[PDB]
Amino acid sequence: EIRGVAFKELFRFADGLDYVLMGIGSVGAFVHGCSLPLFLRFFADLVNSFGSNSNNVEKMMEEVLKYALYFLVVGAAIWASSWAEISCWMWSGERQTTKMRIKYLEAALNQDIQFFDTEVRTSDVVFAINTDAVMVQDAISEKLGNFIHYMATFVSGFIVGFTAVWQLALVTLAVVPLIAVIGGIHTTTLSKLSNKSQESLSQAGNIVEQTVVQIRVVMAFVGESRASQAYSSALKIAQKLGYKTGLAKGMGLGATYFVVFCCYALLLWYGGYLVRHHLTNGGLAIATMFAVMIGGLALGQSAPSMAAFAKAKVAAAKIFRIIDHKPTIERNSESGVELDSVTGLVELKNVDFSYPSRPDVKILNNFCLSVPAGKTIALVGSSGSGKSTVVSLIERFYDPNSGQVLLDGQDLKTLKLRWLRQQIGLVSQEPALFATSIKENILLGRPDADQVEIEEAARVANAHSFIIKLPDGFDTQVGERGLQLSGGQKQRIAIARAMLKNPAILLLDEATSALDSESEKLVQEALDRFMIGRTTLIIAHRLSTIRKADLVAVLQQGSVSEIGTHDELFSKGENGKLAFKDQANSFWRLAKMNSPEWKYALLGSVGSVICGSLSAFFAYVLSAVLSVYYNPDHEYMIKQIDKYCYLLIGLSSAALVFNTLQHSFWDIVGENLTKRVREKMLSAVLKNEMAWFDQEENESARIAARLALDANNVRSAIGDRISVIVQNTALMLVACTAGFVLQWRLALVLVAVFPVVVAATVLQKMFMTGFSGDLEAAHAKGTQLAGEAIANVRTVAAFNSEAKIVRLYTANLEPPLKRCFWKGQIAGSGYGVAQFCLYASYALGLWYASWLVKHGISDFSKTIRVFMVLMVSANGAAETLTLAPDFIKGGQAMRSVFELLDRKTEIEPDDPDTTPVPDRLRGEVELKHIDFSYPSRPDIQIFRDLSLRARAGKTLALVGPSGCGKSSVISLIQRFYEPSSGRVMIDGKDIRKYNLKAIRKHIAIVPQEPCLFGTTIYENIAYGHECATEAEIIQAATLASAHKFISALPEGYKTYVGERGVQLSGGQKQRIAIARALVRKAEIMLLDEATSALDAESERSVQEALDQACSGRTSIVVAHRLSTIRNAHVIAVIDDGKVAEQGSHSHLLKNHPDGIYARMIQLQR
């Protein structure tokens, strides 16, 4: 393996235009990075001019106008630099990435099958195609531009700070590592607790997933309550972990605020000290502090670029390894003969391929094809001696061991290596259809063909008429993902594609595509009477054209068996717009269902408000301190600065306290809300139908994913976003109030530019996040096509369509190229315009402050205070707007949660009130006029008006044929699937109007696949019954002949078992399930098949256990029941669900069992 290549090597796919783009983008990034500290210096100069010249109004007005013009210049420079950076970097990255994918696909498809067998796998190649975005579309596309921009910002900030005020620059550069380490500790602790809480949520996910995977036994034994308890307990652990994260986040953020304010208080004092000794100015001091912070933050933001560079170096090393390899098969270099006779006579002295996946084996030894030209030959064999390898041998995949292969007296090795594939038409088991058009998927066999013979290929062979009446249209891009769900049309299209290909040599294969349609008759209609006859191996059907083939050519032990007449058989065991009113109502309902926590939530809200005010207060103090810097009275200045520093220390203490308070309390209410939501979701899902769990949409893994994802994202969004909106609204309110009470009509014009500032700062936040959207989905179609081509590399090499596939790949990756260029240009222009308007707004505000001061309307202090307070208010509003999309996502997840909760269920496990049930019954249950009871597939019909009657204290052993709904009759009794017209009469009355949990506690079942709970055996039997205790568990185990093995387990009587643990043998799990059914000690004991492949003695033990279970009370057993039936009074032998005579095993009436039971007994004996 490789740990990465040199960074420069990532640019070997850059032409002159790419070099120009990278140079322009680098220059733009450098200037954009240097611009911000330059604007800080210009702001310092403007504030110095606007405060130090208070007496000389004309001079300060002129200098403020000059520096507003400089602000406009900086805005234009940022516009140009950001446009250049964003657009050029995105375009160059897109171009290099696209040509990288193109070259990688062509190099990979050029490789031989050995490269995909012993070298880098097909799945690894598809994964590299996937992660080429991380490889070259991340590091050098935009992350390189961000790295250059942030390094420029860091260097420029340091230079500006050190030139302006070097004393303050040094002390602030000493300060920055403190805030850095405090922030690092906060993030480290928060992330650590978040990971731990994630593991607790993962355990909860396992619980709900296990609950839904075995929902059958869970719902049957009314284990919904048990599942809820387990899920709630796991939720509780994560809830406690969430409380820890809440304290950590509040403490860490409060500590960071405590550190900054305290550090600034000293720095502000030190700036006052510097103003006293006339070293620098107040504006210079403020700019120096801000520049040092900005440089440190720039380095912090540039570190992720280095991480991306490292991971991209590793990935680029992977694809450099893959491309730099050249195939070993190309030694011929197309230097053979292309004039051999089309009537090829392949002779194979040796056929061994020696698969490099499992080398040094000889699964094929001396098999000789010797196929007659024009006569359809066959081939049969076993999987362990795979016959498809022979097909590979004729396709010249270049793995010789001892012998050689000759084509009509000509070696394949010294031949064309390209014309060979031109004769050889191949259709393997998979259809190997690509994402491109069906017309293209037929054309690529013969590129030179026009549409006439393209249509003729699907007309003469197979059936083109399906395409004629195809609803989507004549030409289709194979639909979206799959046009044909059945897959037979895929086989017909593959055969038509091979028919456009030269029919000289066919290699038609088994084509085991689960055919149960006209697909067979069309396959025997397509290329079963073709004029020539070549190799054709088929195992799908014992009779499919294999008779019609003249030579059987039996293959086994790596050699050909008796060949010739096919009449004789061989000894084998072959079988054969969106309204927001609804969202507001949903949020109101969520708040109402979260009523008990409101108090604490409200308390946290209070803290949030305080936090917001504190921030604004801090800003005010900062601005106020600036005002105190330009004051002739030094003693009054010292008193004011000391008062402000003490107030800032108090602000830091309150910030710490109320930050911990707000974040702890908001995370407490969020944790409680999400836990309650999860519990309601589980209660609602466990209150659903069985068909609901059987629905295609409600996959178990997808139910778990839905619950976990929507719960956690709703928690995060609702909680954190509402916290930040509350605190930022408090910030904005107190900030606007302070500005208006200090000096109105300047706050008015700053509010006039408020949308400009908030929009520019939102775009700044987006630029920090990144302007490239979902990068993997940008090349989704090209990635999918590349993956399909790689997985089907055998077909691609066989049809000589690798160049055509690469051209299709270029046609697929061009639209992403154009879209990325346009998006980069639009993003650059928009960001530049936003920044220019931001700096124009800043210059206008400062100039209007100067105008107010000159006219005597106000003074410097009030103006600067209002300005810096309104600018932090705008920053807070920007945070609110940029976190609004989290509100959107939370709203969509909320409506998902509410459609999950508010859905109604036809079957009610916990009914409000029904007819009370007697404690003990007699067990007589009757199923009259029942139906299929499978709403998932109503087209299939089973149990055609079935009439089944049980008997009190008597077992029924209906067997039926295979696949007749054998294990579904029991589902009728427990109301799992509701019959549309049937009647399940229990103890004289229909069960529908009766209770569900109480009666379902009176019936036990053993599922076809017995299941496990938790990790031990005791918990399952304990799950079986609340009175299971230990004695009842042991006696039930003895009844199921299990205790003897339970006491004989390698570890104690409860070992490590379960789906998540280590599973036992099949018979042991059978007996555990039976023992649990017995410990349920139910009046009705439904049973199922339990002896699929059990050992003989185990089979007898299971038979005995079932005998005792059936002798206990009324029971229903639906196993195969070849013998030891314990003389069931009737056996409902139903043929495909229809009404039939209830012949018994004792053969009282030798009419129905004689016609059905006799032959299956004879076969089983």
mmCIF file of N, CA, C and O in Angstrom, residues 90 145 728 970:
data_model
loop_
_atom_site.group_PDB
_atom_site.id
_atom_site.type_symbol
_atom_site.label_atom_id
_atom_site.label_comp_id
_atom_site.label_asym_id
_atom_site.label_seq_id
_atom_site.Cartn_x
_atom_site.Cartn_y
_atom_site.Cartn_z
ATOM 1 N N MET A 90 -12.594 26.787 -8.496
ATOM 2 C CA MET A 90 -13.616 25.775 -8.735
ATOM 3 C C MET A 90 -13.519 25.220 -10.150
ATOM 4 O O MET A 90 -13.613 24.003 -10.353
ATOM 5 N N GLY A 145 -7.504 26.801 -2.521
ATOM 6 C CA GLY A 145 -7.792 28.224 -2.497
ATOM 7 C C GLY A 145 -8.048 28.734 -1.094
ATOM 8 O O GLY A 145 -7.567 29.804 -0.718
ATOM 9 N N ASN A 728 -29.639 35.657 20.075
ATOM 10 C CA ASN A 728 -29.337 36.671 19.073
ATOM 11 C C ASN A 728 -30.447 37.708 18.982
ATOM 12 O O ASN A 728 -30.186 38.876 18.685
ATOM 13 N N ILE A 970 -51.697 -19.537 11.358
ATOM 14 C CA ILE A 970 -51.577 -19.060 12.732
ATOM 15 C C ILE A 970 -51.698 -17.542 12.781
ATOM 16 O O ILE A 970 -52.265 -16.979 13.727
#
